[PDB]
Amino acid sequence: TDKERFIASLMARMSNAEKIGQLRLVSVGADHPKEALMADIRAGKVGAIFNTVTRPDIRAMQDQVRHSRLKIPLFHAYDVAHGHRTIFPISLGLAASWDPEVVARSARISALEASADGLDMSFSPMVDITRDARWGRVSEGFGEDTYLTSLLSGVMVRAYQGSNLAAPDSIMAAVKHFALYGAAEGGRDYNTVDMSLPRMFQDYLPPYKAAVDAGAGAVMVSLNTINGVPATANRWLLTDLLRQQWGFKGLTISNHGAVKELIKHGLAGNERDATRLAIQAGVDMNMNDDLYSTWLPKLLAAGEIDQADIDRACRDVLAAKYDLGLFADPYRRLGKPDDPPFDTNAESRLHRQAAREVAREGLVLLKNRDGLLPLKKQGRIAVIGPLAKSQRDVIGSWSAAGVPRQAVTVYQGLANAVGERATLLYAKGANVSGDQAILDYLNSYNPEVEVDPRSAEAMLEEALRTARDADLVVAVVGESQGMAHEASSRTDLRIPASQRRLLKALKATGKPLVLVLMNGRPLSLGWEQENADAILETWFSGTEGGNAIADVLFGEHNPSGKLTMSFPRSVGQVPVYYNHLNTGRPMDPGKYTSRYFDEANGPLYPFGYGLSYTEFSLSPLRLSSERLARGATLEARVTLSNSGKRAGATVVQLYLQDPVASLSRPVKELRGFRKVMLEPGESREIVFRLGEADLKFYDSQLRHTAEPGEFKVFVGLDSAQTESRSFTLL
């Protein structure tokens, strides 16, 4: 209420011009040249900045505020998605850690680095559920599961915002993209989203609510339609749900041009009408298109909006700044006047230890025939493929202020790990794509892919010569990071054809073949699963990726990563996800079942899958009783043993099924997990606790209750290989 008092006294002093100026969020560029923008800040016409990311540049902008009548400070934002300068694995790789503390650490270090550069806010976490592998932005989320993504949503917010949003090493989380953005039809970015309310409430909305309940300060509004209404114009979504039902008290931010794009969506015929729809829906802050500054005065004078629409939006911007500590000290993240200057990109400001330890936890072992991995540091290892020496790709998409030249390649990680104990032989083998039109797409803004001027044939002949001179081949293959970014949707989920030709040529040498995969989405890997001797999924593993990958390949780290998104056998099976409905004719096999005829059915690799260099055993599942009273707790116990020869971690997963309900419920739903590190011969009793809240679902009328009757409890080391027992809720 100090905050409410402070904001009400400030707003009672402000003109409408000053209130509207708070709603303007801009980036320096063609549309807002630096000197003109500086003059607007001085006039009180700017509320905040994004994409200005160094302390002297931010401090210069904050200095301009002292010229405005009320000297209301700016906040500065950036897309710190999975690292600021030190780049962690992409979020899909962090999720595969199954370890909230690992994910927390990446977020904390991101906030530490971003706040050290003067940033107040990140447009993160991204908590959109993804069941469609074709979407470019699957790399930005935590996979297909509502429970896990909801958990990590809360973890990311708490880790960014810390104990106090006014702390100089805290940043505000702007959770995105509200809402349902990863359900785009056809996996085409920005495309139509259409879904029932029970699916929306049960599966898609809970991660956004988890962020709000963790106290997220901001929400970034999505670019897509929800059931015909763009999120930027959706009063039900942004007012009724987010504010009135969920109690969100923070700031809504539009995406770039989102208010103007209501004209392309066909909700508005002109910019004046687009502005009215966005502010009355509940969008507080207008990114870059400047429609609010242009049209809000005219709309109010015409009685087309209410003073309360402006007041709500302005209070939310001021409340964000208040919580960030900026009214107490606008320079709290910008140090002192005549602090000595520093190199923003100095090696001494990176966190390589943390990036290497985090990156180890996300690597997923998918195949390991006859214990080929871990490798011994000996002999001659051929390192082949267009991603082996790529610094640009290892840091991934949404690499923020990450510097490619600071990153450790797979080749360099292997060189560092073996030193003089083994000989590495390098050949590029193929370009990332053989299709010049795809290479031109990827290099269209910036040179992001090195195109070897040699023929495909010459590169292959060199790679075969290299393979013949080696004891075994480490093929580093998959996507370049520009294939799994905003607007980069794919119609094919395989490794690119140029690289598959290389893999088929390398297989024909008879040399043991280890695949190191880099990719930002599930890939179709049927040929690789049949033909490679071992397969390690490394996503894009970040600044220290090459070192983390070498640590796993040589057995310094026993792989512990597990998939959080199902890998389809082909793009033609989309969508595939573990928490699907049974249907009336489930596939076991019979012709008259829910299936395809022209390919094997089910995912190639299921949700929760990942191998180890050791063996684990689970004892029989035991429940604390066969009947559960309302308000009572059920315990599900299992003993995990390391029955192999190497220390390692696995993830014990708990799944629930509600086999008779008022709605058809999923064949199983994740409801808990434990990541457990065990030395050989160690045993751990795992105790899962379940209550009524774990058993609730949204019915056809969106009643959120648990119905009496049977529940099935499954425990295992993936979604496919479980044991189950039942109990009855009374």
Ligand X SMILES: O[C@@H]1[C@@H](O)[C@H](O[C@@H]2CO[C@@H](O)[C@H](O)[C@H]2O)OC[C@H]1O
Q: Which residues bind ligand X (CB under 6 A)?
A: 79, 123, 176, 255-256, 486, 592
Residue from 99, 145, 448, 658 binding a second copy (CB under 8 A): 658
- How many residues interact with Mg ion (rule CB under 5 A)? 5
Of 232-240, 296-304, 525-533, 657-665, the window that binds Mg ion (rule: CB under 5 A) is 657-665
Q: What angle do CA 163, 22, 111 make, to 5 degrees?
A: 30
Compute the half-sphere exposure of residue 694: CA atoms within 13 Å on the CB side of its CA: 24
- Tell me which of a second copy, Mg ion, ligand X, none is bound by residue 79, counting a contact when its beta carbon lies within the kind-specific cut-off of 5 to 8 angstroms: ligand X
- HEC profile of 431-447: CCCCCHHHHHHHCCCCC
Structure tokens given for 347: 């090696």
8 Å CB contact between 557 and 425: no
Binding to a second copy (CB under 8 A) within 515-574 occurs at: 569-574
Binding to a second copy (CB under 8 A) within 700-719 occurs at: 700, 709-710
CB nearer to Mg ion: pick between 487 and 660: 660
Please choose, from the candidates 156, 104, 110, 121, the residue with its C-alpha nearest in 3D space to the C-alpha of residue 399: 110
Residue from 339, 492, 626, 635 binding a second copy (CB under 8 A): 492
- Tell me which of ligand X, Mg ion, a second copy, none is bound by residue 707, counting a contact when its beta carbon lies within the kind-specific cut-off of 5 to 8 angstroms: Mg ion
- HEC profile of 114-174: HHHCCCCEECCCECCCCCCCCCHHHHHCCCCCHHHHHHHHHHHHHHHHCCCCCCCCCCEEE
Binding to a second copy (CB under 8 A) within 154-173 occurs at: none
- Does 661 help bind Mg ion (rule: CB under 5 A)? yes
CB nearer to ligand X: pick between 157 and 717: 157
* Alpha-carbon span 120 to 322, nearest angstrom: 12
- Does 223 help bind a second copy (rule: CB under 8 A)? yes
CB count within 10 Å of CB 340 equals 6
- Tell me which of Mg ion, ligand X, a second copy, none is bound by residue 379, counting a contact when its beta carbon lies within the kind-specific cut-off of 5 to 8 angstroms: none
Burial class of residue 381 in the structure, from the number of CB atoms within 10 Å of its CB (0-12 exposed, 13-18 middle, 19+ buried): buried
- How many residues interact with a second copy (rule CB under 8 A)? 84
- Does 29 help bind a second copy (rule: CB under 8 A)? no
Closest CB 293 distance from ligand X, rounded Å: 19
* Alpha-carbon span 528 to 535, nearest angstrom: 8
Of 69-77, 222-230, 450-458, 661-669, the window that binds Mg ion (rule: CB under 5 A) is 661-669
8 Å CB contact between 324 and 119: no
- Establish whether the linkage from the previous residue to 575 is cis, with ω within 30° of 0: yes
The angle that helices 410-418 and 545-553 make with each other, rounded to 10 degrees, is: 50
Residue from 269, 379, 681, 708 binding a second copy (CB under 8 A): 269
Compute the half-sphere exposure of residue 498: CA atoms within 13 Å on the CB side of its CA: 27
x-or-dash string of contact with Mg ion, 680-719, rule CB under 5 A: ---------------------------x-x----------
Burial class of residue 376 in the structure, from the number of CB atoms within 10 Å of its CB (0-12 exposed, 13-18 middle, 19+ buried): exposed
- Tell me which of a second copy, Mg ion, ligand X, none is bound by residue 262, counting a contact when its beta carbon lies within the kind-specific cut-off of 5 to 8 angstroms: a second copy
- Does 194 help bind a second copy (rule: CB under 8 A)? yes
- Tell me which of Mg ion, ligand X, a second copy, none is bound by residue 575, counting a contact when its beta carbon lies within the kind-specific cut-off of 5 to 8 angstroms: a second copy
CB nearer to Mg ion: pick between 681 and 709: 709
Binding to a second copy (CB under 8 A) within 665-684 occurs at: 665
- Which residues make Cβ contacts (< 8 Å) with residue 12, sequence separation at least 6? none
Annotated binding site for Mg(2+): 658, 660
Phi, psi of 51, rounded to the nearest 5 degrees: 75, 15
- Tell me which of ligand X, Mg ion, a second copy, none is bound by residue 378, counting a contact when its beta carbon lies within the kind-specific cut-off of 5 to 8 angstroms: none
- Tell me which of Mg ion, a second copy, ligand X, none is bound by residue 194, counting a contact when its beta carbon lies within the kind-specific cut-off of 5 to 8 angstroms: a second copy
- Provide the residue type at 6 as one letter: F
Residue from 12, 308, 346, 660 binding a second copy (CB under 8 A): 660
Give the chain's largest Cα–Cα span.
Answer: 80
Closest CB 606 distance from a second copy, rounded Å: 16
Phi, psi of 76, rounded to the nearest 5 degrees: -120, 130
- Does 491 help bind a second copy (rule: CB under 8 A)? yes
The 3-state DSSP class for residue 68 equals coil
CB nearer to ligand X: pick between 255 and 579: 255
Closest CB 663 distance from a second copy, rounded Å: 4
Binding to a second copy (CB under 8 A) within 292-331 occurs at: none
Residue from 36, 308, 487, 660 binding Mg ion (CB under 5 A): 660
Phi, psi of 66, rounded to the nearest 5 degrees: -60, -15
Binding stretches for Mg ion (CB under 5 A): 658, 660-661, 707, 709
